Amino acid sequence: RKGEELFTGVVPILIELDGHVNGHCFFVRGEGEGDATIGKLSLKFIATTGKLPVPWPTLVTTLVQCFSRYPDHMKRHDFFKSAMPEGYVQERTIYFKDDGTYKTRAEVKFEGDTLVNRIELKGIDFKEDGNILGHKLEYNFNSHKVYITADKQNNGIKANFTIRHNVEDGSVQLADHYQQNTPIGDVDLPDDHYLSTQTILSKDLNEKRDHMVLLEYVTAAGIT
Amino acid sequence: GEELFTGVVPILIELDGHVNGHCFFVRGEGEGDATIGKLSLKFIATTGKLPVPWPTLVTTLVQCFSRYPDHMKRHDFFKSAMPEGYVQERTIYFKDDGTYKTRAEVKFEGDTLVNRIELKGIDFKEDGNILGHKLEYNFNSHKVYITADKQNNGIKANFTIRHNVEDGSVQLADHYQQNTPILPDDHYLSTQTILSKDLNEKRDHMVLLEYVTAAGIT
Ligand code: NI
Numbered sequence: 001r002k003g004e005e006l007f008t009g010v011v012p013i014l015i016e017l018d019g020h021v022n023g024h025c026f027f028v029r030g031e032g033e034g035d036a037t038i039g040k041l042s043l044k045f046i047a048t049t050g051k052l053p054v055p056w057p058t059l060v061t062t063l064v065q066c067f068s069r070y071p072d073h074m075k076r077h078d079f080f081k082s083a084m085p086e087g088y089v090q091e092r093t094i095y096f097k098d099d100g101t102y103k104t105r106a107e108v109k110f111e112g113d114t115l116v117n118r119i120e121l122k123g124i125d126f127k128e129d130g131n132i133l134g135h136k137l138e139y140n141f142n143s144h145k146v147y148i149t150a151d152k153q154n155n156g157i158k159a160n161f162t163i164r165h166n167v168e169d170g171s172v173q174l175a176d177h178y179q180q181n182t183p184i185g186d187v188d189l190p191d192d193h194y195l196s197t198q199t200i201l202s203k204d205l206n207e208k209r210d211h212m213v214l215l216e217y218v219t220a221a222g223i224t
Numbered sequence: 225g226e227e228l229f230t231g232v233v234p235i236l237i238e239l240d241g242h243v244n245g246h247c248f249f250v251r252g253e254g255e256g257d258a259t260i261g262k263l264s265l266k267f268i269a270t271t272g273k274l275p276v277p278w279p280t281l282v283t284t285l286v287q288c289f290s291r292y293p294d295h296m297k298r299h300d301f302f303k304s305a306m307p308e309g310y311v312q313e314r315t316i317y318f319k320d321d322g323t324y325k326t327r328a329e330v331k332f333e334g335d336t337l338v339n340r341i342e343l344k345g346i347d348f349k350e351d352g353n354i355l356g357h358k359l360e361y362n363f364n365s366h367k368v369y370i371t372a373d374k375q376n377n378g379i380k381a382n383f384t385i386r387h388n389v390e391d392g393s394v395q396l397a398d399h400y401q402q403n404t405p406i407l408p409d410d411h412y413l414s415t416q417t418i419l420s421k422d423l424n425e426k427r428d429h430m431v432l433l434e435y436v437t438a439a440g441i442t
Contacts, residue, residue, distance in 0.1 A: 018245060027245025049245040 004081040007036040007066065012114045013043060015063055021123035022100070022133065024053035030063060030214075034115065036081070039069025041216040044204065051210045054123070055137040057165055060199060060214070061177060062092065062104045064117050065146075068195050068218040077190030077223060079148075079157045079181065085110035086185025088156070094163075095176040100126030109184060131165070131173045138166040139201055146195035156182040157190065193222040226303045229258035229288070234336045235265065237285055243345030244322070244355065246275035252285060252432075256337065258303070261291025261436045269428040276345070277359040278430045279387050282417065283399060284314060284326045286339050287368075290413050290436040299408035299441065301370075301379050307332035310378065311404050316385075319396040322348030331406065353387070353395045360388040361419055368413040378404040411440035 015030035032043030045056075045063060052059075066080035080088070087109025094102035106119040126133050142164045151158045159179030167173050200215045237252035254265035267278075267285065274281075288302035302310070309331025316324040328341040348355050364386045373380045381401035389395050417434045 018242075020247075023247075025242055025245055025247035 002085060004075065004078060004084075006084050006110060007081055009037075010035050011067075013041070013064060013067075013117070014111075014114050015043070015045070015117040015119070017059065017063060017119040017121060019054075019059075019121045019123075021054050021102075021121075022126050025049065026052055028052075028059065028063065032214075034064060034067035036067045036069060039067065039218045041067055041214065041218075043214045043216075045212040045214065046207075047210040054126075054132050055135055055165075056201065056212045057137050057139065057141055058096075058102075058132055058175070059121075060141055060201075061163055061175075062094070062102065062106070062119060062121055063214075064108060064115060065090075065195065065218070066108065066115065068220050070220045074193065074220050074223050076188055077193055077220070079188050079190055080108075082188040083181075083183045083185065086183065088181045088183050091180045093178045095178075096126070096130075096132060097174040097176070098127075099130045099132055099173075100124055107184065131167050136168050137173060138168055140166045141199035141201055142166065143199075144197045146197065147192070148190060148194060149192045150189040151180070151182075152189060154180075154182050155187060155189070156180065191223060193220060195220055225306055226297065226300065228306050228332065229256075229303055231259075232257050233289075235263070235286060235289075235339070236333075236336050237265065237267070237339040237341075239281065239285060239341045239343060241326075241341070241343030241345070243276050243324075243343075244348050247271065248274050248276075250274075250281065250285070252339075256286065256289035258289045258291060261289065263289055263432065263434040263436075265432045265434075266422065266425075267430040267432065268425070273428045276348075276354050277357055277387075278361065278419065279359050279363055280318075280324075280354055280397070281430075282363055282419075282432065283316070283385060283397075284324065284328070284341060284343060285432075286330060286337060287312075287413065287436070288330065288337070290438055292438045296411070296438055296441055299411055299438070301403065301408055305405040309406050311406055313402045315400045317398045317400075318348070318352075318354060319398070320349075321352045321354055321395070322346055329406070353389050358390050359395060360390055362388055363417040363419050364388065365414070365416045368415065369410070370408065370412060371410055372407045373402070374407065376402070376404050377407070378402070379408065409441065411438055413438050 017028040019026040026049040030045035070078040090106040092104045102123045104121045146161045163175040165173040202213045239250040252267040292300040312328040314326045325344045368383045385397040387395040
């Protein structure tokens with residue numbers, strides 16, 4: 001008995017990520033809350049497998065766009081919420097310029113009250129002591145524009161954008177994202193528009209394990 | 225079909241798995257003699273020390289080598305599906321701990337019997353009996369209850385493995401098994417297993433001796 005109606009209030013979030021980069025395996029679990037009426041996430045991620053083989057920032061995009069704030073005049077362009085509760089599949093290919101690639105497949109859906117993002121990630125061809133495996137990325141995340149277009153053919157959407165990762169030496173590591181979402185059930189197909197993102201990364205001062213506290217604001221725009 | 229097991233047969237076993245995101249690969253080699261129901265295998269953990277105890281991997285490391293007494297040959301699904309082979313799927317629920325999901329192909333490649341497995345382990349406790357390595361290095365005797373699954377033209381199986389824990393308690397692991405051929409009346413397999421070491425092999429390893437015999441039909 002619902003739809004976008006599942007997001008009128010504060011929703012508990014659970015994220016799990018199975019990761020495989022250059023034969024190094026890891027697992028991340030995140031917990032927190034989202035509030036789509038204001039577009040806010042507040043999450044804590046733990047690398048349960050011990051210290052990560054890649055930098056935390058490289059995982060941020062891949063770790064619930066259903067918590068974007070879609071302004072009242074854009075509600076009919078909100079694919080992510082309309083797929084709920086059965087949810088959607090989110091697939092990406094992430095190209096790190098002059099370095100390796102991530103391929104991800106994710107199921108975002110309601111499991112009871114909770115919104116759950118379960119992810120498989122596989123990364124290949126990363127250079128040793130490149131920015132990623134060498135851990136040369138600053139513990140930062142930049143603002144971006146996620147460009148969304150409809151994919152009528154598969155009853156879903158496509159997304160394109162370039163993530164910018166600050167490197168320690170003052171340079172910038174680019175990560176080209178190509179994104180597909182399709183429904184798991186049986187949705188709104190949007191006119192072209194974008195998401196505007198902002199993200200803070202910090203730590204829990206009493207947490208011994210490798211981890212990431214994340215706060216994020218995202219609003220939809222580009223339609224008048 | 226059955227004719228492929230009237231003498232000593234070489235075995236190769238390969239397990240690609242990860243448990244709570246901890247990866248590991250295991251290779252096993254040796255022999256089975258299905259007329260007496262005997263397995264003799266050596267398993268190597270390439271990739272280093274295993275994140276889980278060797279005993280938890282036993283069941284999911286070739287039941288076609290069970291001894292099926294003459295009066296029960298009609299009920300041997302395992303052997304009949306050869307050389308084509310079969311697919312073995314399980315879910316193993318460790319009581320008060322995590323779960324394994326496994327998929328395996330058991331088939332003849334040339335003259336050798338091959339068991340190739342995939343394994344996902346989820347939701348294990350960090351200082352539970354598994355991830356904390358609190359299981360004794362041995363292995364109890366069991367009854368594997370087999371039934372017919374006409375719908376998938378194969379069999380199901382259920383049983384409960386008992387793992388001895390160092391403090392003297394018992395870690396139970398509930399097995400659920402499906403086999404499909406890429407059929408018998410109700411019966412069970414009687415198992416016994418000894419595990420040991422090879423003194424000249426450093427790599428985390430398991431040598432396994434095992435005798436299995438089918439019963440439950442007079
Ligand atoms: Ni995997």
